[PDB]
Amino acid sequence: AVSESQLKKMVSKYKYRDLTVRETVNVITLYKDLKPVLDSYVFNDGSSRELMNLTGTIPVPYRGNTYNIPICLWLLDTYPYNPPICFVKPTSSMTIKTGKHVDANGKIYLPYLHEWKHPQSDLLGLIQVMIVVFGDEPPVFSRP
Amino acid sequence: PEPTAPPEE
């Protein structure tokens, strides 16, 4: 994690870059499988803007195993509380399973942000909740 | 590590 240094630099805009970098590192520090990615898209009336996001294959445990499921979510600035954009990014050799959590595009359903908002939960807890769901049921179980 | 995802049954 040498980019981490350049990361805080790739942002240095967020309300709490430090607090953010600390929240991100914490995540990868808990998983070590995830990786913070950088993205540059337009927003301000169509004006390029730096936006962060987490990506990587989380170690999804099973009844007696632990696979790796890809996930990607956009990290907002600091509102309203957490990033509502949290969807799975499966490959092409996989098989997305439609349900109450997933539709087909691999977009996590439910309000979540408009559910817990204890908040109590944290960036980690967020990816933790999904891991709990992605651990119980197959979010995109692949084939042999 | 590659994703793939855990299979069913």
DSSP string, A39-102: EEEE-TTS-EEEEEEEEEEEEEE-SS-EEEEEEEEEE-SS-SSS-S-EE----SSS----SSS-
Burial label, B3 (beta-carbon count in 10 A; 0-12, 13-18, 19+): buried
C-alpha span between A101 and A134 (Å, rounded): 9
**Residue A45: both structure tokens together:** 């009336």
The CATH number given to whatever domain includes residue A86 is 3.10.110.10
Q: How far apart are CA A75 and CA A2, in angstroms?
A: 20
Return all residues near A75 (Cβ < 8 A) that are at least 6 apart. A20, A24, A51, A52, A53, A54, A83, A123
Rounded Cα distance between A128 and A115, Å, is: 15
Backbone angles phi, psi at B3, to 5 degrees: -75, -90
Question: Among residues 53-92 of chain A, which lie with CB inside 8 Å of chain B?
Answer: 57, 60, 62, 65, 67-70, 90-91
Task: Say whether B5 and A65 touch across the interface (CB within 8 A).
Answer: no
Residues in chain B within 8 Å Cβ distance of A62: 6
C-beta separation of A76 from A15 below 8 A: no
Classify residue A52 as exposed, middle or buried by CB count within 10 Å of its CB (0-12, 13-18, 19+). Answer: buried
Number of domains in chain A: 1
Cβ–Cβ under 8 Å, residues A100 and A110? yes
Q: How was this structure determined?
A: NMR
For residue A102, the distance in angstroms to the closest alpha carbon of chain B comes to 15
Angle at A19 between CA A15 and CA A21, to 5 degrees: 100
Give B-chain residues touching A95 at CB under 8 angstroms. Answer: 5
Residue A57 identity (one-letter amino acid): T
> Which residues of chain A lie closer than 8 angstroms to B2, CB-CB?
57, 68
DSSP character for A131?
H
Please choose, from the candidates A43, A127, A143, the residue with its C-alpha nearest in 3D space to the C-alpha of residue A88: A127
Which residues, in sequence order, are CB contacts of A137 under 8 Å at separation 6+?
A97, A99, A101
Question: A46 is in which domain, residue-wise?
Answer: 1-144
Edge-to-edge, what's the strand order for the sheet holding A48-61? A34-42, A48-61, A66-75, A86-87
Q: How far is A14 from chain B (nearest CA, A)?
A: 30
